[PDB]
């Protein structure tokens with residue numbers, strides 16, 4: 393109103409029939425921290441129709457980016473799927489979220505554990521110089537059902553290591569670990585199963601989580617997150633907050649409404 397900026401769509405790409413990304417302009421007033429979410433959506437019948445969305449773009453990029461589900465009868469995404477370049481969206485002005493470095497004690501390895509659209513905030517974090525200064529390795533796990541749901545997989549593997557500003561840090565420090573559950577692919581499984589078997593650690597070449605070295609951000613389905621939270625706490629890791637830095641922090645990629 394006043395609670396929103398209007399932005400224009402500058403590009404759009406559909407990954408699958410349930411996943412798409414788009415880029416927009418960015419109001420010069422807008423600021424956020426990598427990992428945060430805002431309310432995004434459309435003016436519908438002169439009223440805002442908005443939903444929580446992670447900001448997928450890099451923190452000082454002159455533009456915004458969203459990585460979105462398409463839910464066929466979802467009030468927002470049943471509309472938002474039909475976006476075209478030039479269309480208007482609205483974006484709220486007060487970012488929030490728990491996916492923040494300072495909610496974590498200092499460490500050596502940051503594991504970004506995601507399913508589905510829960511990759512979104514991590515697309516911002518892995519484009520933040522700050523993360524590479526704070527952590528010697530950043531391990532991005534992205535778990536999906538189908539190989540075509542590995543949104544950004546060519547960008548992450550092939551383009552991002554060539555970035556002028558981030559490329560050498562990414563070549564040296566980012567370990568990208570896509571995994572698929574329901575189609576043939578070189579890496580298969582749920583990240584829960586891959587942690588319990590030890591397979592994750594063997595494949596990325598790092599030791600099993602330890603209290604001194606390893607920190608985690610989790611973003612994905614409620615079920616993944618409840619199960620992975622139990623895994624980490626059984627291993628002695630504690631949830632961080634702003635008042636008390638811990639070893640992991642959690643954000644839902646969506647809620648079952």
Ligand SMILES: Cc1cc2nc3c(=O)[nH]c(=O)nc-3n(C[C@H](O)[C@H](O)[C@H](O)COP(=O)(O)OP(=O)(O)OC[C@H]3O[C@@H](n4cnc5c(N)ncnc54)[C@H](O)[C@@H]3O)c2cc1C
Nearest residue numbers: 443444445446460461466467468469509512645646648649
């Ligand atoms: C902190 C937070 C951040 C979020 N960030 C994102 C984001 O970056 N991208 C995004 O696409 N959504 C994200 N969501 C989900 C988003 O808020 C909306 O639910 C989504 O835009 C769909 O809106 P809708 O009105 O079409 O359907 P809704 O009525 O909101 O959702 C209906 C149902 O669709 C399913 N659902 C909704 N969102 C998702 C999803 N992302 N993945 C899988 N299933 C889903 C659930 O079954 C849900 O009950 C986030 C939610 C939270 C709480």
Ligand SMILES: NC(=O)c1ccc[n+]([C@@H]2O[C@H](COP(=O)([O-])OP(=O)(O)OC[C@H]3O[C@@H](n4cnc5c(N)ncnc54)[C@H](OP(=O)(O)O)[C@@H]3O)[C@@H](O)[C@H]2O)c1
Nearest residue numbers: 507508509535536537573582583584613614615616619648
């Ligand atoms: N938390 C929930 O309530 C939840 C969870 C998943 C799906 N869904 C339903 O399915 C739709 C799509 O969900 P989605 O975007 O999460 O996509 P999805 O394609 O259902 O799942 C994404 C990836 O997460 C894995 N996964 C599922 N449960 C997990 C767990 N407990 N721990 C670790 N990984 C797990 C999946 O493995 P598998 O192939 O083995 O399932 C898959 O590889 C939702 O909109 C909703 O209707 C709900």
